[PDB]
Amino acid sequence: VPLDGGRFATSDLNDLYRRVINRNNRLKRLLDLAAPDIIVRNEKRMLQEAVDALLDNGRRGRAITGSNKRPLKSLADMIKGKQGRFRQNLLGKRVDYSGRSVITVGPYLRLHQCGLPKKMALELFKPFIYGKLELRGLATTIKAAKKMVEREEAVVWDILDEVIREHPVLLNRAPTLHRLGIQAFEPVLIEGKAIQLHPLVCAAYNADFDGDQMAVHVPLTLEAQLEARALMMSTNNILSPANGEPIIVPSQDVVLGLYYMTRDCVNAKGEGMVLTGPKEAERLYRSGLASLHARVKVRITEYEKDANGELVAKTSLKDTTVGRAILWMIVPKGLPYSIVNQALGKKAISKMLNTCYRILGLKPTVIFADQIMYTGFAYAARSGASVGIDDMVIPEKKHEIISEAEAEVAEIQEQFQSGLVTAGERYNKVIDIWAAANDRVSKAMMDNLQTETVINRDGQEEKQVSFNSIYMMADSGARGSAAQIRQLAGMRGLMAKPDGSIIETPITANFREGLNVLQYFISTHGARKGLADTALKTANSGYLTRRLVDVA
Amino acid sequence: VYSYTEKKRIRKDFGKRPQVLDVPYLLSIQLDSFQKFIEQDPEGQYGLEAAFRSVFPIQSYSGNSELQYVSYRLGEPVFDVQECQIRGVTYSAPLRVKLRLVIYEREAPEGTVKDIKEQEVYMGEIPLMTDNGTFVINGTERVIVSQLHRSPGVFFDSDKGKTHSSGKVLYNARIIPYRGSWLDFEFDPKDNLFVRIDRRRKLPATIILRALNYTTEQILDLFFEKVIFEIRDNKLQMELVPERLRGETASFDIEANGKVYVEKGRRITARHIRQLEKDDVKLIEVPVEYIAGKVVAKDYIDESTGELICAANMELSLDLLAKLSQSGHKRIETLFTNDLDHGPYISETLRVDPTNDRLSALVEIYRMMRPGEPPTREAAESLFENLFFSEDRYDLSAVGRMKFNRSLLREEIEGSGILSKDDIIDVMKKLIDIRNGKGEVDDIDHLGNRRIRSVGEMAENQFRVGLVRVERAVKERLSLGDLDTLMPQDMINAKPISAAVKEFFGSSQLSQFMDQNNPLSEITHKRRISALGPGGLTRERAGFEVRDVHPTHYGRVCPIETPEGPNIGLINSLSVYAQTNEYGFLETPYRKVTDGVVTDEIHYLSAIEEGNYVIAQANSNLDEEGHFVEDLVTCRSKGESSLFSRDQVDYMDVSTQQVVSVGASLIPFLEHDDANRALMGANMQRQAVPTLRADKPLVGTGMERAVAVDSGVTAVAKRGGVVQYVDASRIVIKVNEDEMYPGEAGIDIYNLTKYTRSNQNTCINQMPCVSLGEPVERGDVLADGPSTDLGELALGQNMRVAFMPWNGYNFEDSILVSERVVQEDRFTTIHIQELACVSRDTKLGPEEITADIPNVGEAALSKLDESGIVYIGAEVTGGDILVGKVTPKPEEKLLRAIFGEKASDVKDSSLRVPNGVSGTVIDVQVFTRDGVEKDKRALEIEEMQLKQAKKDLSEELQILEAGLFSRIRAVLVAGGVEAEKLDKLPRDRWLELGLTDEEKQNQLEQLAEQYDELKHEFEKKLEAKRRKITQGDDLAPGVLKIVKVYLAVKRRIQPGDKMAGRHGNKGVISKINPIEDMPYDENGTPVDIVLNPLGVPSRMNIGQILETHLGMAAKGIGDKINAMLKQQQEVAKLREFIQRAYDLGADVRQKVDLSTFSDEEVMRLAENLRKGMPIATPVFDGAKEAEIKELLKLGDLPTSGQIRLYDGRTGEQFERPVTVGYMYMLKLNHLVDDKMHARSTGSYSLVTQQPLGGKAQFGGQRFGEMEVWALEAYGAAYTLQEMLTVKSDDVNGRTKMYKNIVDGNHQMEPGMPESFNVLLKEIRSLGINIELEDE
DNA sequence: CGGAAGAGATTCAGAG
RNA sequence: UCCGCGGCGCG
DNA sequence: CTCTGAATCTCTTCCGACGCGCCGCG
Ligand SMILES: [Mg+2]
């Protein structure tokens, strides 16, 4: 390597070869002199050790170091090891025609297409630009095309648009884990500096928008283009190879919007009329003369495939709310109307997708998914499901429940100070009574929160489901579970010592109120334990995957 | 009462606990360590003199020549700090030492020396530490963190489990010296004492027992007691006390005084033992069979011939008894032979002895330490004495022996560093005690075994290594010393120690580079504790016990702030009130508590001792008279916490603040949020970047002032006084009469720091925040640095934020952003790059820096000087010419350059702008070698540098000379006062007032010299400075002149940036949205930032909710102030309004009023409230729900904080009220322009024909292995062939494909991967034959 | 350095 | 002037 | 007595995710 001045930090192999050739030169010179046996065997010994170190270093004591302080590299080092030749230059090698950027959402694309920033688009397809420019003949040599593309004249963006129209590309996620980590998309030119993704793919990628970065690749030949559009495509991969359940299940916002969409308070303005179709219901909602959701009889027409290959129409006067009908307005023909009369949970929508695929082929399922995502964002923006500090209603009986709890802990202590019980027995049963208190407070707060809403109901009174934001986010299945609300509003359970032993004093506070230092310290114990667990587990997981993919 | 400087703006505060202790100096560790490392302390006491007196004196071995130490001195640094950083040299200082050399008479060793020599000798230089606690090595800043390692002492570990899993625990004893070989004691399942030295082979303890000059009888008497038997006629009567009968079955009929107490077989409980104790006689009678397995203690020998009847550690047999009774030695001393109280491990331990002799033991350890060597008696003795008797190669610090004596339950405090024999004997005794079961092992995570180091002691250690090396060299030279033939420095060399310290500061796992972006990183990157580096474990030697936090960490090590990922808990941070003990342990304060009253005075407590006492929880309801309103309170004991009585505790914690780190203490409402979320929030906050103009966060914690002041990134008044002149460059302050020194004090000058490159390419800047002619108070801020304003810390800004899902643009966490922020340029940031051009002197033509370049247009020279360097202030873009550097490519053969040629082609090597970046020239730096031509542009740059370098001195002298002229005026009051010429004759020219008095001229003439001396120092300061600018610069050989240029880029917000708050909320900006579509209220104002409410359920961080309501309250006062101040109302209206504003608290210690204030003071305070109300909040004693609720009542906002909102696009009501408010947004330095990158066809590598890597080179991405197997998982085949053969490796394939693609016939060719051909070569290069085969 | 593994020296170990 | 080590950070 | 042998303890070796960015020193 030519380095500064006459200095060249060359490879260790040069030094090893120089050493051994000097050794051989001295030895072959000295055998001419009929030297005594002692010195000649000393030279043969040191030559033997030198060539042994040349072939492999480290197998002998006091391995010869390199420049300053580290053992020099060898041919054995060049062949084996993570830094060896295989796993850095044969199994995986750097490739041209690629690029890297950061992801955004841009939730207005179609599932079969993705965006791509303009400067990246110009950079990637320069040979295609040269070829098409030669095809139209507006340039003569490579230099003319090069200067024209460097000037970024407006006369080339139309060629650039033309060469995209169905020329696909590839995406990559750096910690590629399973087969869905690589997909293909039909690119569309977009302004900006970041990659745009359809939202339903990030769940398969398990790629949050925290700042993950993608790689791109470009198929070149006709074989490559057909190969990409055949199997690389996002459309024809809708079942996981691990289990038949789909992989385009919605995650966070459309599920919230539809869940809020299909709930009915018993009394609301616009209650108690009849309509002949979803279209006029949509019109009435846009008029604002009726609530988003109220019990309304409607005339619904539905199709079904009793005939072997043909659809049959039938009509009725179903009883439902307006939101169910307006959602029915976009549903494809095959599915029966009974498929939407429930509350449309996470499991419900997954079953929706699975049944739609199993009965109505492939394409209508895809367009149904895209359109339901559109409507989910639309009505989730329309809803306005904000959060508020006043939402988290704390149960009141829990305070005297706690008071009782320290009453029995004082009682058991004062038996224990009379020799009645031992430390282990009292330990177990204070754990038991504390757990029972946790059960009671958790159940109490759940029943207080679950149906707090009450209404006069066109008359005296009635009790119905709740409309708290926290509850509707919870039972939707979007984010969190019951335990999260248990931790937040109610008592935060009880934590254990780092070894695994349980602390006798439970966490008698909650996040809505203040927290004293010691319980926060124990929470720190738990959180640090979990973070260390995952951080150490990642490497073993990856290594196990490597061995298993090698063995079979 | 408050200073006028605090009266710029007062911060609303909450909290009920009255603080008593002040936050200490936040840089005490580094400052104390470095100050202790260099200072003239007698007797050393962990100082440089200690290392000197350790290494000194030096004596020639039997040569009667002595070198003895005298003293050392340090001179001033030859350079400054700032221009030293600019140039590139370190900020070191010379080391001047005086050495005394004497040579004894060869006829008398104790006789007087013939001569004495003494001289000052210079050797090396050592780096210096600036007030901010920094270091300079090569024109940069580097900082050394503090190391954390196990203290030298003894440990006892269980190691239960892995070995022989279906078996009980083992035990092991470890001794680690401060400097020396390790030594390990451990057990084995067969239960033998084994010793291992320096992780070598396993050896029995008996070898070192005998090598310590001990006979077998001595050893057994040491480890065991006596059981005596007598040769007696009646069944050999014998003596027993019931102490050894504690818990045994009766193998005999228990009889005494001819009366059997209990028969054989009955277990002897305590009752039988006491029955024996009544009239307890010892001599009893037993049968003979019991001694069958019992072992003799002494060595009885025959008397007929002296043959050994029985040796130690062998049992007895009836024949042995008979033929020892034939000799008549009645006393039979035997072994105790216990089972559950004294395990007889020593017996078989000595039984499996390989040898039996001291010399044999020495030979064995000789061959154990060095394999394959001839055994020598003296060599074995020499190595044995050179392991634990040699004070040179083995030693312990005083702390080592301290913990050694503490662990062994000893009482001695001070001994010797080297070990002894009885100490390791005691280690034997305690280890066998532990194996018996009694006693207790010690853990590792307990901080009473954890030791902290700092810069001073490791610097001393490296320096001591250098001195022992050079001492070896000096003694080697002195072995041939002569009779006074030289001056005592020719034998010393400054090269070794200087090289050693320079390598230590330069290359070390403890001297990390410092991340210079914001003052928070500055203060948190210094108080950092690491467990890596030499002497400690590495990144993957970590189990789980080191990872998790320990209860002793409370109040001493922050549990919540640590980096996550590859290393967790290894880079833990130190607490806020913690400090370093004298020995090297940690300490935390406590409040002394009497019987029922807590005193104000405090104590510092170590880690080991705190278990002896009990401490109460900090936020206990202390009464007004220092009592507890309850009769019971929870208190943390040595093990855990428990509710204790009124009179059980003796110490009180100082405050709630002492639990977390500095970075953690800045998060408001921390107590309402989860641990991991707070951790990631702190990890982001350490990485912020200052914006164009700062502004105080509306929700603070009160710690901003302390961190802002203590971190020296701002101008602090060394003395209080009166502003005289202010400017954007310098500040002039008048000194008060009381503060000025009696001898010609004068005034002070503060030089600001302008736009300059930082270590992280950020713009360090200083803006004054003081008006003209203002009384300034001692120890207060004058100029604001980056991300600081008016003396408070302000990283990000405050946004109007709402929580609502909108059109999927906030899908997972993506941050939607309004156009108004970039409209105001309120997140605009600045980066400063650095481009370097070298001018080497190489063959084939020395490099030229001319402006003449072939094969280029005139566009370059349109923006270039004739020197070739760009003019200052050029709007250059990517790929533009910056510096013009070009390198060229008898009587009959040299003239052919004109005959058959035209001219020599000089090759361009111009440093261009890296592609993709714009910029503007702000500074050009040029350095020149000693004796090289200086081109035109370099000449004026030093000329502009020259004239400013003399104006500031002239400006300084002009003010400096003013003070001496007042001495003329004070003395010469009466006389001829000139009407008009009072100023034409300046304040100096008064000795020429026409005539002069015979005595007045004397003082005038006398002081005339001292002005000349002030001129003289002006001359020398001018003359010294003009040399520094004129002199060249030693560099690497070959290079001739450096060309440093600087760029400034104005970074704007664009979709893809990384936004974050102060409660862990991540995010990237998805879409920029024009103003018209943003949601807006009934009043008319829009909203700026819209988030996703779904973050709260999943990741439980409710704290970000509570701050948002406060933001409305903070603005809710401010806009009401803004509403009233727009119309000129009388001052008392706001005066009562602000009075109630700073009123209206539950129970606070603030207790401020407004009556004492002047009207103009209140008016100038009002205008600083145009933006709102800064509200303080302690970490744990913060505001609760109720007082937040009633605070909004003072505003004009709904009680719930819940507001209905209007749509921007469709414009209607929302049938759910939405939550809005304020929130503190900062910016991360992870942009998009520095990450997005691609290539089509660039360079290739040499060893393999593969594309390059990294973004700096025009390289691409790496096709990782993992996506390989992913690809054949789909039925795809051709791409796998196509990607890694024709696009990466094949050379003929790509060029054909490159030629084929430009014609549209997309076709692939197989080729052959040349990397595989590379593979076959070296595997061929050995004895292996391998190649291809038939086609 | 934890763990696995595997080869190798050792060391009883009943059959003699 | 583009090879190698160490350290920090990000996912 | 001498095995053969069947464990048994000793000693050595091989290994421990991926990808990128930044900075420093030979
Ligand atoms: Mg991520």
Author numbering:
A (entry chain D): 253 to 804
B (entry chain C): 2 to 890, 897 to 1342
Q: What did the paper state?
A:
RNA polymerase (RNAP) frequently pauses during the transcription of DNA to RNA to regulate gene expression. Transcription factors NusA and NusG modulate pausing, have opposing roles, but can bind RNAP simultaneously. Here we report cryo-EM reconstructions of Escherichia coli RNAP bound to NusG, or NusA, or both. The clamp and shelf module of RNAP (collectively called the swivel module) rotates relative to the RNAP core module producing interchangeable conformational states that have been termed non-swivelled and swivelled.
Two classes (~40% of particles) contained very weak or no density for NusG but differed in their swivel module conformation (~1.3° to 3.4° rotation). Here we show swivelling also occurs in a canonical EC.
